[PDB]
């Protein structure tokens, strides 16, 4: 009878039919991602196209229910998410062309190879070939070749596609009444008509930038310390005042400085807090890694992994004959089917990833009760922050010692404290300017602030200004260095990694308070704390049923992202780095370049 009662009926039909269409689309995607074949890629596309058609039908049907005449928040939020037009606002030819560009960029990235000029059959792929060089190599020339060949063979290929992608994506966004595609992406954080809990898309830029200014001093000190350590590692190649050469940062882009730990470890003679060798010495396998991660969640009150998780997950590389996509992924197929796809290596980085991804699975298991459309994290940063919560605890020396990866005679010194925080800062702090500058570039490109003839010019001026990282070789406008990173060429927003980083320390602070933890936040392990587990579960089971400003407030008591807990976590390291850099330069000159002479 009423418009709300009518919408409720419509959503009951939707929730009913969505179960099978979504599960068949997800299962096909799973069967392709674990057994890459032409038969499986077509099956994945067939099921995915059926899901998209259902979503486009239900979207146009949801339009006749004005969400203004809706009082029930649960039905209003489901209707709000369904009546989003998105890509369907484009003409048939433009939707076809845009999907063509998206698939072409995705396959150029996943199949792009750098080759020997005199032996074209001898080639390397990004994963594992070029990524192994960037993670382990100590030779400046080899790292420079791997870095420049990636950006030259593959990045140059993506450039014309990216130019076309921004045009169509902007047409799609402007037809949906957004300023541009960047504004469209910032809509994930937007909350409206909720007094006291509202959040605008423009507020995200102001908050990210205001927060970043407070990060700046900790980063500059971390950057200066690393720069001094890198001068020992690569003599004659680094300036004491200049930026850090882009090819020497631990990975293909410098997204994380994690692999610089061997080169920058504060106290090398102390028992290693990188248990990667202790795992290898103890003959740990991916099953032990995953069973150990499962034991962590059970200890805080959460459930064991389902039988189907242990039956259907792919926790190792199939490698020979059966080829798989090795990006660590947590799958919520629906119908109570949860799986993890990850080609686990016996490393501490993968041990921490197993905890991160099972945290994603735990969030999925928790909000499964919610209606279909509300089965997601409060915002894009929620799922990523939750996995990182698990890593923060898993990584502590207190935790590694309790699980056997650190000798029972391990003594926590003030030096092991700095060894720990430095390792954490390389990953967590090191990625914040990289992430901010990456999105800032896209936002400006989508806005129209950077003309095509200055894309790469601005990318490297921003890398030198914001990140303090400088291209080892000059790049003209035939390159597209942003697209040489997965999220850029695979159409994923990147600011989730910046917001999740800040949320994780707010949640960790709240969770340790629940666990009656005494002492520094970095010495906290929420293991064997059901109080902390309950506080987390009450937020996990909520999904998207409450606005993120409210969802965050229910756990941390703040309706907005805050940099204070992140800074308190790294306080001992900040005061240490300050003294280490007493006779060092803190900051960088954007004029020095490895190729200047």
């Amino acid at each position, epitope marked *: 009878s009423t418009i709300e009662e009518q919408a409720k009926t419509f959503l009951d039909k939707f929730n009913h039919e969505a179960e099978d269409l979504f599960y068949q689309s997800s299962l096909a995607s799973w069967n392709y991602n674990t057994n890459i074949t032409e038969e499986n890629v077509q099956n994945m596309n067939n099921a995915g196209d059926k899901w998209s058609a259902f979503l486009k039908e239900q979207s146009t049907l949801a339009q006749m229910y004005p969400l203004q005449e809706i009082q029930n928040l649960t039905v209003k939020l489901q209707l709000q998410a369904l009546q989003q037009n998105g890509s369907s606002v484009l003409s048939e030819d433009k939707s076809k062309r845009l999907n063509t560009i998206l698939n072409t960029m995705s396959t150029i990235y996943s199949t792009g190879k750098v080759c020997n000029p005199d032996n074209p059959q001898e080639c390397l792929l990004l994963e*594992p*070939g070029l990524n*192994e*060089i960037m993670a*382990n190599s100590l*030779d400046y020339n080899e*790292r420079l070749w*791997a870095w420049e060949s990636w950006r030259s063979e593959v990045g140059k290929q993506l450039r014309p596609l990216y130019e076309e992608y921004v045009v169509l994506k902007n047409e799609m966004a402007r037809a949906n009444h957004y300023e541009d595609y960047g504004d469209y992406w910032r809509g994930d954080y937007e909350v409206n008509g909720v007094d006291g809990y509202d959040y605008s898309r423009g507020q995200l830029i102001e908050d990210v930038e205001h927060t970043f200014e407070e990060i700046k001093p900790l980063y500059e000190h971390l950057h200066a310390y690393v720069r001094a350590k890198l001068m020992n590692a690569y003599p004659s190649y680094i300036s004491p005042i200049g930026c850090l050469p882009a090819h020497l940062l631990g990975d293909m882009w410098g997204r994380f400085w994690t692999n610089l730990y061997s080169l920058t470890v504060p106290f090398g003679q102390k028992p290693n807090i990188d248990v990667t060798d202790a795992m290898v010495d103890q003959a740990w396998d991916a099953q032990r890694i995953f069973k150990e991660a499962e034991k962590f969640f059970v200890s805080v009150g959460l459930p064991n992994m389902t039988q189907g998780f242990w039956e259907n997950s792919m926790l190792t590389d199939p490698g020979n004959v059966q080829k798989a996509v090795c990006h660590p992924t947590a799958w919520d197929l629906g119908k109570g089917d949860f799986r993890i796809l990850m080609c686990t290596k016996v490393t501490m980085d993968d041990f921490l990833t197993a905890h991160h991804e099972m945290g994603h699975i735990q969030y999925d298991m928790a909000y499964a009760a919610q209606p279909f459309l509300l089965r997601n994290g409060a915002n894009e940063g929620f799922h990523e922050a939750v996995g990182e919560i698990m890593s923060l605890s898993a990584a502590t020396p207190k935790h590694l010692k309790s699980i056997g990866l650190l000798s029972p005679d391990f003594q926590e010194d003030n030096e092991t404290e700095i060894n720990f925080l430095l390792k954490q800062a390389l990953t967590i702090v090191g990625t914040l300017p990289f992430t901010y500058m990456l999105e800032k570039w896209r936002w400006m490109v989508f806005k129209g602030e950077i003309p095509k003839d200055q894309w790469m010019k601005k990318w490297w001026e921003m890398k030198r200004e914001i990140v303090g990282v400088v291209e080892p070789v000059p790049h003209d406008e035939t390159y597209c260095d942003p697209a040489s990173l997965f999220h850029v060429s695979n159409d994923y927003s990147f600011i989730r990694y910046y917001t999740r980083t800040l949320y994780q320390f707010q949640f960790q602070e709240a969770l340790c308070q629940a666990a009656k933890h005494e002492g520094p936040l970095h010495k906290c392990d929420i293991s064997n704390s059901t109080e902390a587990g309950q506080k987390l579960f009450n937020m996990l089971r909520l999904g998207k049923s409450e606005p993120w400003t409210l969802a965050l407030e229910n756990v941390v008591g703040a309706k907005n992202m805050n940099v204070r807990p992140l800074l308190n976590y790294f306080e001992p390291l900040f005061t240490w780095l300050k003294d280490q850099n007493k006779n060092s330069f803190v900051g960088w000159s954007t004029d020095w370049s490895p190729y200047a002479d």
Partner: nanobody, 126 residues
Framework: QVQLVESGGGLVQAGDSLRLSCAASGRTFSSYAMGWFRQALGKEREFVAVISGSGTSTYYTDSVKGRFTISRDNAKNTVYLQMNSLKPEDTAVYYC???????????????????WGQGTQVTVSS
């Protein structure tokens, strides 16, 4: 001080197998590629095989492809070279060497190897 010591050189017949072992000192063995070279009497030192720092990637010269197999045990700081179906043309002094870098594709010439063994003579008869 980085030192490399080859072991296993000897006189064999045609078709027989022979495994050369190479022990290398240093706590960063896994960070560099290890390669084998050979030098016949009167001929220049030539490349034979290379294995990446992780062991998951290998490369062999055309003359030994499908006969020789390069392996490494990062736990024991050793690199091995199994030489099956040996020919008189394989008779040379074999050297194991440590590369400047990690990969197989970038480290397969003498100008990429800063540390070398003292050599081990392998002789093959008719």
């Amino acid at each position: 001080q980085v030192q490399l010591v080859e072991s296993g050189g000897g006189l064999v017949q045609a078709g027989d197998s022979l495994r050369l072992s190479c022990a290398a000192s240093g706590r960063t063995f896994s960070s560099y590629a290890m390669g084998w070279f050979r030098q016949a009497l009167g001929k220049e030192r030539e490349f034979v095989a290379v294995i990446s720092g992780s062991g998951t990637s290998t490369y062999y010269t055309d003359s030994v492809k499908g006969r020789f197999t390069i392996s490494r045990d990062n736990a024991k700081n050793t690199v091995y070279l199994q030489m099956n179906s040996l020919k008189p043309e394989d008779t040379a002094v074999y050297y194991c060497a440590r590369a400047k870098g990690f990969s197989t594709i970038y480290n397969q010439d003498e100008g990429r190897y800063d540390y070398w063994g003292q050599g081990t003579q392998v002789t093959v008869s008719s």
